[PDB]
Amino acid sequence: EAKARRAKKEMVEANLRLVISIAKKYTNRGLQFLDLIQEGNIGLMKAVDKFEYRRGYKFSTYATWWIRQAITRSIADQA
DNA sequence: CATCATTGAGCAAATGAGCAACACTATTCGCATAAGGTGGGAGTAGTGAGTCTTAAGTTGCAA
């Protein structure tokens, strides 16, 4: 279990540049920036929880959906 | 001697505000999306006077 968590932390630590890169889009919707980066961090955590590698795709395309889920979810109910 | 007004006394009829209990539906909430997308951006520019605080530079001075 601890080994698996080390792997998952390691992957998240890889994909932070992805999450700020997508985080540039929806900035000025009446919320602050680091709220977006943290929500997106949650979203990529969930995307790590739901990714499989034997599918054969690049991780980012699958991850994108969970990130927009977290962002648009968060600004949606935090209007 | 009779009687009634006149003071208590309480009631049915009626009604206004509920109550619980089921039963049904509107709304809300929470989860998903697969080729790929892996460092922000606005940030002011024409105050001045003072006062407290560090920080550093210098400088006697004594063992």
Numbering used by the authors: 369 to 447
Q: What's in the article?
A:
Bacteriophage Q protein has served as a paradigm for studying regulation of transcription elongation. Through its engagement with RNAP, Q renders RNAP resistant to terminators. The Q protein of bacteriophage 21 (21Q) was characterized as sharing a conserved mechanism of action with Q proteins from other lambdoid phages. To investigate how Q renders RNAP resistant to terminators, and to visualize sequence-specific interaction of Q with QBE, we determined a crystal structure of 21Q at 1.45 Å resolution and a single-particle cryo-electron microscopy (cryo-EM) structure of an intact 21Q-engaged arrested complex at 4.08 Å resolution.
Consistent with the result of GreB cleavage experiment, RNAP is arrested in a backtracked state at position +14. Nascent RNA from +6 to+15 forms a 10-bp RNA-DNA hybrid with the template-strand single-stranded DNA (ssDNA), while 5’ 5-nt RNA threads into the RNA exit channel. The structures show that two 21Q protomers (QI and QII) bind to the direct-repeat QBE site. QI has a large conformational change of a short helix, H2, which is detached from the main portion of QI and moves 30 Å away from its original location. The loops L1 and L2 connecting H2 to the main portion of QI also move along and form a ring-like structure with H2. QI and QII contact subsite 1 and subsite 2 from different faces of the DNA helix, making similar protein–DNA interactions. As expected, the mode of interaction of 21Q with QBE subsites—binding of the second α-helix (H6) of the HTH motif in the DNA major groove—is similar to the mode of interaction of σR4 with −35 element. The main portion of QI sits on the exterior opening of the RNA exit channel and interacts with β' dock, while the ring inserts into the RNA exit channel and interacts with the zipper, lid, zinc binding domain (ZBD), flap, and β C-terminal region (β CTR). Taking advantage of the flexibility of the flanking linkers, the FTH moves 30 Å relative to its position in RPo and binds to a groove on QII. According to the structure of 21Q-engaged arrested complex, the ring-like structure of QI inserts into the RNA exit channel and serves as a gate.
